Amino acid sequence: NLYFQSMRILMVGLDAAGKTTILYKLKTIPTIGFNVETVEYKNISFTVWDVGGQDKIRPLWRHYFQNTQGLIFVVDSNDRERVNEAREELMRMLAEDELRDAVLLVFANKQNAMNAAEITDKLGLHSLRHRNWYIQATCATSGDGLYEGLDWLSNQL
Amino acid sequence: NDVVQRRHYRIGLNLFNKKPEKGIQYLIERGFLSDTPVGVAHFILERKGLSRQMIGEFLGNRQKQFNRDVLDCVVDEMDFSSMDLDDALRKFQSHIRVQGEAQKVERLIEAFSQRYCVCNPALVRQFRNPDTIFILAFAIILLNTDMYSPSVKAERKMKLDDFIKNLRGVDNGEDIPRDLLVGIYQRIQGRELRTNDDHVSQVQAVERMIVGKKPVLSLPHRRLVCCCQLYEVPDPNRPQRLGLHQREVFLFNDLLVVTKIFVTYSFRQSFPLVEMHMQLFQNSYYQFGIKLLSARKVLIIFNAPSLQDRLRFTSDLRESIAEVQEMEKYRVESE
């Protein structure tokens, strides 16, 4: 890890999954608009965007897909009622051709919560053929697992 | 009785700044607030001491029908007639802190774009798809994040043409008139989107004066009450030099912060106000004494420069303690 590298990561996930909490533990008054903090890990500088929106809004993010090396998807392991729309949230993002080669890190947050195998199936992770992905059990409020997934993410980039 | 009611009022504000819907419930039961979404919209827009960040958290909720109706009421109070979209968005965000997750930002821009169209039906009709105003407003605040976020390095910031190219074909395959976007970009380039100040702004300013390691002070519910100069007394039974151990004390509604001059200050110690007790004393070596305890247990001893300084500080502290003990009583009645 000789050279300092700057990379862009996109954080995707439903509201209340824990995107803000995870981003808070890995970084003045935040700039008005969308969360975007810097994460420096092992001589890698990660600019991390919080991304989202409905269909007609999504194409505004394509400008930021071009220089995107990693995707971080946060799912609430406890909200089984919303896991299917979480899957749609993840899959709609993965349908963008500009994100074809980005690596996928899934934070299973809030570990009667679904386990890793349950979330891997309900989120359809194994349907991604040419995708390098990894699911990491984490507790956003206790910082557990955050840096293990960040270990995997950096090792892949 | 009159002081106890303004205290209960401030309790309502505190509760909102921690969980807004619990403060709304609190202020309604105690008889301070109307329970209709239009009354809450007026309260939110007008009353001071509300965290504009937490107002956004409350208004941005896309699952609760009450929060959504309140948000609709909030925008109905604003008039965007004959305003540039970015300008109207700036006026809208000046009230609510439009910052956070992409989903929260979307909900707020959503209600805002709906209000802007009602306020400009002619101009909106000039577009193949009125969804353009919403998509454009979203893109406006996105430009603000891109352009002014310190975490987006200069070289990678979106240039004017990257902005125009990011909006190509939005209007049912047509483009937004290019001369228009250039105006939006330049205005945002000349004035960053900025929220109106609230009470958290005064705590943030105290955080800046303190250099070095420190606790996180500017939490949404915390309000600055008093700044006072005192002398820490390690031994009230023995004298100390004139002006020794001079402190810069910061009294918040739920926290006592003790600093010294490092103007810049070095953080020394903070005390919660729960179980904190207070007693004034005056002996031969200390005429304006202040002793803080916990229940019993000495926390620290002060000697004010004058009795007015002790009278003013002690008064604020006595009320902040009583206010905090109200928070405890409620925060345990949480069944």
Residue numbers in the entry:
A (entry chain B): 12 to 38, 45 to 128, 132 to 177
B (entry chain A): 398 to 659, 666 to 698, 704 to 743
Report text from the authors:
The Ras superfamily of small GTPases are guanine‐nucleotide dependent molecular switches involved in the regulation of numerous cellular processes. The Arf proteins, with 30 members, are also regulators of intracellular trafficking. GEFs catalyze the dissociation of GDP, allowing GTP to bind instead, and thus produce the active form of the GTPase. The Rho and Arf GTPases each have two distinct GEF families, Dbl‐homology (DH) and Dock homology region (DHR) and Sec7 and Sec12, respectively.
Although the general mechanism for GEF‐binding and the exchange reaction differs between subfamilies, some overarching similarities can be identified. The GEF associates with the GDP‐bound GTPase to form a low‐affinity complex. Upon nucleotide dissociation, this converts into a high‐affinity nucleotide‐free GTPase/GEF complex. Binding of GTP converts the complex back into a low‐affinity state and eventually the GEF is released, generating the active form of the GTPase. The GEFs bind to the GTPase, induce conformational changes within the switch I loop, and stabilize the complex by interacting with the switch II region.5b The GEFs generate the nucleotide‐free complex either by inserting residues to hinder the GDP phosphate‐binding region and/or the Mg2+, or remodeling switch II to destabilize the guanine nucleotide.4, 5b Compared to the intrinsic rate of reaction, GEFs can increase the rate of exchange by several orders of magnitude. Several interfacial inhibitors have been developed for the Arf/ArfGEF complexes. Interfacial inhibitors are defined as a drug that targets the interface between two or more different biomolecules that are found in a functional complex. The drug site is often generated by conformational changes along the interface generated by movements in the macromolecules.
